Amino acid sequence: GQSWSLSVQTLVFITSLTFLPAILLMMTSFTRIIIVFGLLRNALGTPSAPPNQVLLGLALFLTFFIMSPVIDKIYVDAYQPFSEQKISMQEALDKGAQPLRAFMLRQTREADLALFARLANSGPLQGPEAVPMRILLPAYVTSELKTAFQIGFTIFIPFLIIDLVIASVLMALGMMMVPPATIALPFKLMLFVLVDGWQLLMGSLAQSFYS
Amino acid sequence: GQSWSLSVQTLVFITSLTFLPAILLMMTSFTRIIIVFGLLRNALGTPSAPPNQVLLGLALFLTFFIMSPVIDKIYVDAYQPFSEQKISMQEALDKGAQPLRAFMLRQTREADLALFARLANSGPLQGPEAVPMRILLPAYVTSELKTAFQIGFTIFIPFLIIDLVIASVLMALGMMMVPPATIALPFKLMLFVLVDGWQLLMGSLAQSFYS
Amino acid sequence: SFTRIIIVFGLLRNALGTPSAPPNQVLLGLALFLTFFIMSPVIDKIYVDAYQPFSEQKISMQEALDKGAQPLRAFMLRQTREADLALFARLANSGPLQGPEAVPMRILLPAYVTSELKTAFQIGFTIFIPFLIIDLVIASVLMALGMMMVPPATIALPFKLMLFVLVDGWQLLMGSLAQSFYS
Amino acid sequence: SFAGQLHAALDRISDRQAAARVQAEKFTLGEPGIALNDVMADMQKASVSMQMGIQVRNKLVAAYQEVMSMQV
Amino acid sequence: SFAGQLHAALDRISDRQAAARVQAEKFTLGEPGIALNDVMADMQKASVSMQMGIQVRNKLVAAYQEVMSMQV
Amino acid sequence: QFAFAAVRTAGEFIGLQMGLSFATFVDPGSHLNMPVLARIMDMLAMLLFLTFNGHLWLISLLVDTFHTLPIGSNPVNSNAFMALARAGGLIFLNGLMLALPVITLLLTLNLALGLLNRMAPQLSIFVIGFPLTLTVGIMLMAALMPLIAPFCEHLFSEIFNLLADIVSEMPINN
Amino acid sequence: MTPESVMMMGTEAMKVALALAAPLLLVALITGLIISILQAATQINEMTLSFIPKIVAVFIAIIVAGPWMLNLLLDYVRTLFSNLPYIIG
Amino acid sequence: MTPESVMMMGTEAMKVALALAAPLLLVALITGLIISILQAATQINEMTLSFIPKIVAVFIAIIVAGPWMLNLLLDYVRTLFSNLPYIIG
Amino acid sequence: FELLDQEKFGISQFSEQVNYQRALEGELARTIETLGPVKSARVHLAMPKPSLFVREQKSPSASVTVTLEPGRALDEGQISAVVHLVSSAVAGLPPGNVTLVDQSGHLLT
Amino acid sequence: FELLDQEKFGISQFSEQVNYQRALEGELARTIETLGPVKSARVHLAMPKPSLFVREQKSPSASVTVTLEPGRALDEGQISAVVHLVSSAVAGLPPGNVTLVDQSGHLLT
Amino acid sequence: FELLDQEKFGISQFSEQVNYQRALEGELARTIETLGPVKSARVHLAMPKPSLFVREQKSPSASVTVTLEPGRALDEGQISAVVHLVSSAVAGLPPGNVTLVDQSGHLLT
Amino acid sequence: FELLDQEKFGISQFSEQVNYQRALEGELARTIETLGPVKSARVHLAMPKPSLFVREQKSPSASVTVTLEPGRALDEGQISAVVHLVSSAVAGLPPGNVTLVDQSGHLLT
Amino acid sequence: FELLDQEKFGISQFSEQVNYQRALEGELARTIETLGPVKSARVHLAMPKPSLFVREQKSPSASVTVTLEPGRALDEGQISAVVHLVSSAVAGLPPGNVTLVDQSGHLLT
């Protein structure tokens, strides 16, 4: 059998500890969540009304919850055979990364995947599962970026409707030359708090993740 | 020919490991890509909406896919003789740099290199395949940052047109103090996502780099 | 050598209307390349007058330092300014004389620094002016039609970049800077 | 590819270290054939390989952080 | 003339190291005319030259990083 | 920077008289009117500083301050911060003195256009008023440039005269 | 690229501006004209009594227009994005 | 630099703005005056009722003006960049 | 064909590639009619483009339904005439997917 | 000719490269008619513009359907006349994709 | 010739390089007519340079269809006259891609 | 001459360098007519223009089609007269690319 | 000359350096006419390929087409008169690129 010595194993673990929170979290689950949060912040007609730290914390908690089944899968499939040294890191890493690869494959756009494969000049695949992570990652990022804005426009719509109707009703009576933005903000905030936009939106985006 | 000792070979290799990842990536391969990505983010009307880390990672992956052929060529022509100890480091450097120099010269302009040669007082070259690395790099860099600006302007134009038409129609209907940007931004976003701006844009950029 | 080039590049970047549109790494690399291209004759002369005796061990450092510093001071004297030199001479109570000769290091360096700063700002103003003209004209045409509340920044910037790329700004700009340094 | 090269380098480093360790274990087990002039040399070469690997790791992570922290 | 000078310096360092190595190799095979003190002194001089070279490299790379890490 | 600020305000006030004062409503986003006619004079002023000396005259003040103030335990005198705070003052004083022709000429056009209401109450100043003012206001800028050339020198010496006395009369004020 | 291409790029881009806005601006302008001629024969008005008819006329104009307003936008940008490897040279 | 060199730079900067904007400024007022006359002689109007034709009028003026307006800024900056080694001295 | 000539202000995106296929089918069947033994043909196409990086990519198909003239029968080499007449006039359609059927059942392909 | 004839304000992006192909087919078939033994030809092209997620384009195809004059038959070298007459007038169409068929079945290619 | 004279409000990017090619073909065929033995020519060009993520040249082709005067035949050196007459009047078209055909089949190239 | 006469709204830049080439061809052929043995010439140019930041040769060509006067033939040195008359009047056109052809085939170059 | 008087709103940068070259050619040919043996000249210029450090810079050429008076012939030193008369009136044109031709063929250069 073959494996890696303790020194190289801990070197690899420490090195991966650098990428893991920054990018393996930034470009995998909650980039669209923070994009939606920023779009909602812009739509509210106020810069940084919800603080950035609070938004990031809420997004982190939400993505932790969302990834719970995949976390349990990768735990029970890699850590348990590895925490009792019954498997080596070499294939343990692949076994752990397989469920996340499947999740990325499920949440991908076929057109983006095909374009990236053609750009990489590799078209021998017989099935969607046999794609490499190298070609899977950018397509996943692009699809997540697309769906982020797709949700964001729907978030935008109601505030736009409120602004248009309040401006029209305000200027129909001879008040054309006065900004209705200062007057639309209380109504938009009242509507949002009355409909409970936060709790409803969190469930909506969780269901979107569950497809 | 004479061969450098291992103690200095490792020294020069480790020293090159400082410049090569930083400068040979910053001013050789994807400066236009990051510039046009920043310009597109500005044109979208919502600056800093996509994460900068996500944008940089996607740009790096696209860069690797773009330079895969020349990377493969230099990889074989340098490592394989070096791996089999066929060639020394001194000649390996030039042999590896030759295809990279050819690819760099393929994309640059003519007036830039002419001006740089005139400034450097180098003798006239009757054959184009003689530009030293001293004179090659600045011409390529300036050509890249020149073409990036016009590509970004071409990307900017449609969103400018959309903003102008929406502002004009709003003011014709009689809304003076209504910020068009807060209203056009959903429309710009919808146009972008519906025409698939990201995938089409990156594909077009890759095709432009190829040709 | 080149404190002016980075300043003028920063002025151009701010005139473009977009912060850090080109990477700072690429700006510094281009500045260093242009600096070495410009200083190549002077650097070559310094290399000769220093190494040629020193490599074969013909002179001592106590005079080699002066021999290597004299051409650099001679080059820097042209870039310095008479008014700055006179003011620093007044400050440091040095002999003015009718004919300049071996300006001391305490006086020569600050005069060069301030002269380079002054000429850098002078070039930066003229670089900024065309973008200001474009902004003025686009703002005026926007206001005249009844669109006084539309931000011209999202409109001016594409026009600024289009003009900058269309006039081939980079090549003639660097050529002009090099010619100004030469004479 | 980069992943393939990294895997090959790490695997060869691990194989060198494992060979050195097994040779040292055979020597300390008393089995004749080891003259103490090979185990020490192989351990030193393995330490050199590990030092090269960690220096490369430091340089690579520094470069990655520098290129990733750029204000775009 | 900068890269040429640097390559000349590296050439001199590598040539001195190679001369020391070949002298030691000639001595250890029994060729007469080579002195143990001479080869030891040559090896020490080569090591000193290498140490000077690595010091210069460290200083130069530190200066480069300091001068190109700043923001314009 | 008082000399700069007075120059900065003068350019802005010219712009506010034609189309640049639409931020009079609630606080907008970007000013929508700042770089139009401010940066033209916000950066021309520093050039006139470089015409005489950029840092040389300021540095000469620093050396003389050491002679006046030899660095010691002497407490800093009072009744001096208010005087330099009271200096501007000249921010709006010299601002309008440069603005004497532009302010009057633009207003006369504004008054002239309004008189046409008695002949046609539908003048539509949102249609005709803005285009008419812009061409005249821009034209006044080019022909009034020489008037600004010596005027900026006034503020430089006056602040220098203010600064020279403060740094020299303070040590004898103890 | 020569400045003529930018004018050509501007001309094609600006020509889209007129065509898209034409149905909306024409219906709004004629609506005021329709009221104005109908505002003879005891021309008495309050101030305008004309803005609200502009709403419904333009509002239905957007509805009847619908996709073709967006359909042009999809095609014009698509050609420009597809021509990016050609606008370079 | 003499103070004349300082002020001479501000002249053509405003003059090009005077030259470039005037064709667009004149079109805006000329179109407005015609409608303002139409705003007399049975004066029924809402506020101005001139906004829609004015936007279209200057819009066509962009096509009419087009290149030589763009060409104005092209050579003036080249003249400015020609004296960069000469304005300092 | 005639449908292609027809112009409507409305341009549904999907009804673009369907109003066209309905014209191809009507054009392809107008030639098979002008072929001798055939009195009237009737072809349907089955163009599906949803295939990328899949083991089962699939393919386009057609189904001609010629109605031979009274007292006639297509020979063994007269079948490939009508197969290749359709296999080639349709993008990406191999001759192994074309289905020819008479007016009396009789799957000929 | 037909493309020139088909000039209008309406701008269908797809119907541009289709109104053109319908003219090529009608022009290519007007020459094969002026060819001697042929009385009337009828050609369809199969140019496939789409190239997404495909290793190869797979090229274009054509299917001529000449109707020879009463009592005539194209020789073995008179087939390549009509094959290359179409293989060359269409971009990227090899002569191995052109299909020639008489008015009596008889696939000639 | 007609296309240069032709002026329309529409400025279709494609129909620009197609209204031109249709004029080249009509101009090239007007000279081959003024060539002696030829009574009427008919040339089609095949310019195609589109490619994706590749450096493919995608070289052009032509297909002249001369109709010689009654009782005439182009000699062996009279073929290269009509080949180079077209190979040279079209950008990037080697003489190995030009196809010459009579009014009696007879591929001459 | 014609190019100065050819002024129109048309903002297309491509029809700028094409309306010009069509005038060069008509001017070059007006001189070869005023040359003695030639009764009427007919020249086409093949100038490829795009060339930015590339090493592509992009060399041009021409094809004169002189129609000599009744009972005349250009001598061996009268060919270089008409070759250099065109090779020099066109930018970057060597005399090895000019093709001269009579009214009786007979490639002279 | 006449072109210089003409002025237009259009920014035709290329038609700027072409309306000028057409005037140079017409001015250069007006002097060669006022030269004695020449009855009428006809010169075309070939201003071309601006580049830097190329394998061949090529340079610009010209092609005079003098038509000598009835019963006259330019001597051996009367050729350099007309060569340098054009080589010098055109920027960067060596006398080795000027081509002089009579009204009877006869390349003189």
Side-chain angles (χ1 to χ4, degrees), chain C residues 152-174:
Chain C
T154 181
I155 309 180
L157 189 146
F159 280 87
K160 298 174 181 300
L161 270 63
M162 189 279 300
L163 170 132
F164 189 53
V165 65
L166 180 56
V167 304
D168 294 333
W170 293 101
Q171 39 278 68
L172 43 80
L173 165 62
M174 59 188 57

Side-chain angles (χ1 to χ4, degrees), chain C residues 70-176:
Chain C
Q70 280 293 339
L72 178 62
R73 299 313 182 96
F75 167 80
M76 187 156 51
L77 204 157
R78 186 263 161 181
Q79 302 296 143
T80 54
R81 197 60 270 174
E82 180 177 343
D84 315 341
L85 291 177
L87 177 122
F88 290 144
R90 293 174 177 175
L91 293 179
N93 52 85
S94 58
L97 293 178
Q98 269 290 334
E101 180 270 340
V103 177
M105 315 180 181
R106 286 181 271 273
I107 281 80
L108 186 57
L109 277 305
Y112 171 76
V113 174
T114 183
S115 178
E116 282 302 327
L117 198 150
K118 182 249 294 182
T119 181
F121 261 110
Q122 290 188 353
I123 304 178
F125 171 92
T126 53
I127 292 188
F128 190 94
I129 281 305
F131 304 88
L132 210 44
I133 305 172
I134 300 177
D135 197 330
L136 169 61
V137 61
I138 185 57
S140 177
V141 65
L142 198 65
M143 296 173 192
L145 310 176
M147 290 93 69
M148 63 297 291
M149 57 86 49
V150 176
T154 181
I155 309 180
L157 189 146
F159 280 87
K160 298 174 181 300
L161 270 63
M162 189 279 300
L163 170 132
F164 189 53
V165 65
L166 180 56
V167 304
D168 294 333
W170 293 101
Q171 39 278 68
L172 43 80
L173 165 62
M174 59 188 57
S176 61

Side-chain angles (χ1 to χ4, degrees), chain L residues 29-48 50 59-68:
Chain L
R30 274 205 59 171
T31 73
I32 309 190
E33 286 166 13
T34 77
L35 196 65
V38 176
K39 187 215 304 173
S40 90
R42 186 73 160 272
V43 46
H44 322 263
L45 313 170
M47 298 182 300
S59 85
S61 315
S63 89
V64 193
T65 319
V66 297
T67 294
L68 321 177

Side-chain angles (χ1 to χ4, degrees), chain F residues 33-85:
Chain F
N33 304 271
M34 183 55 180
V36 187
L37 289 180
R39 315 301 167 86
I40 54 171
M41 304 180 65
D42 293 9
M43 218 217 319
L44 259 172
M46 68 182 58
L47 290 188
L48 291 173
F49 280 91
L50 303 179
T51 55
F52 312 91
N53 269 333
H55 291 254
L56 287 75
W57 290 3
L58 275 307
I59 288 304
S60 180
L61 292 182
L62 262 299
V63 177
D64 297 325
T65 50
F66 295 158
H67 288 277
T68 62
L69 281 310
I71 302 180
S73 180
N74 194 309
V76 44
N77 281 327
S78 63
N79 208 20
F81 299 95
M82 40 73 64
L84 63 93

Side-chain angles (χ1 to χ4, degrees), chain A residues 3-5 7-8 11-12 14-15 18-19 23 27 90, chain D residues 7 10-11 14-15 17 50 53-54 57 61 64-65 68:
Chain A
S3 62
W4 290 353
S5 60
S7 62
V8 60
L11 168 60
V12 172
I14 294 299
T15 303
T18 300
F19 301 151
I23 53 173
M27 65 182 59
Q90 174 188 356
Chain D
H7 258 277
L10 294 187
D11 289 328
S14 181
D15 293 331
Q17 286 196 354
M50 176 55 66
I54 62 185
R57 192 275 302 260
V61 300
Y64 175 84
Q65 291 174 348
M68 203 62 169

Side-chain angles (χ1 to χ4, degrees), chain K residues 28-48 50 59-106:
Chain K
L28 262 172
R30 274 205 59 172
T31 73
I32 309 190
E33 287 166 13
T34 77
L35 196 65
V38 176
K39 188 215 304 173
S40 89
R42 186 73 160 272
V43 46
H44 322 263
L45 313 170
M47 297 177 298
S59 93
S61 315
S63 89
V64 193
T65 319
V66 297
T67 294
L68 321 177
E69 286 280 46
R72 213 61 40 87
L74 310 190
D75 294 333
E76 65 175 278
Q78 217 153 354
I79 301 310
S80 53
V82 191
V83 165
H84 298 107
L85 198 53
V86 176
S87 153
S88 280
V90 177
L93 175 58
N97 299 6
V98 184
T99 291
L100 186 68
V101 171
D102 314 29
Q103 81 298 357
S104 80
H106 277 331

